[PDB]
RNA sequence: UUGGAACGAUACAGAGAAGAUUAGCAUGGCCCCUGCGCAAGGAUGACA
């Protein structure tokens, strides 16, 4: 994740590991990348792309 | 070609959660009830 731990809060570390399991950060980034691709793919002949 | 480092580096993976999870029936315990067997035992009905 991109979460920076300011001190060893072990309970918070475990919670954030459970919340961002199965590579959720990469999946979120990829999904937003795909969404921007589609929103820019639709308007390619109007934005002169 | 030949040496550092090897409690390191990188590669993969990363849920570092929490657990002997859970549905059915039968057995077993208890109290009846019903049927049959076994061993005995009660009370009672019946003329020429």
Q: Which nucleotide's C1' atom has the smallest distance to the CA of A19?
A: B15
Is the CB of A13 less than 7 A from some atom of nucleic acid strand B?
A: yes
Is the CB of A6 less than 7 A from some atom of nucleic acid strand B?
A: no
Alpha-carbon span A15 to A12, nearest angstrom: 5
Query: In angstroms, what is the resolution?
Result: 3.1
Whats the size of chain A, residue-wise? 49
Task: Please classify residue A16 by burial: count the beta carbons closer than 10 Å to its beta carbon, then call 0-12 exposed, 13-18 middle and 19+ buried.
Answer: middle
Q: Which nucleotides of B are covered by protein (CB under 7 A)?
A: 14-17
Alpha-carbon span A49 to A40, nearest angstrom: 8
Alpha-carbon span A40 to A23, nearest angstrom: 26
């Amino acid at each position: 994740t991109g979460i920076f731990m300011h001190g060893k809060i072990p309970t918070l570390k475990i919670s954030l590991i459970q919340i961002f399991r199965a590579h959720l950060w990469q999946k979120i980034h990829e999904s937003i990348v795909m969404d921007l691709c589609q929103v820019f793919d639709q308007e390619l002949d109007a934005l002169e792309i």
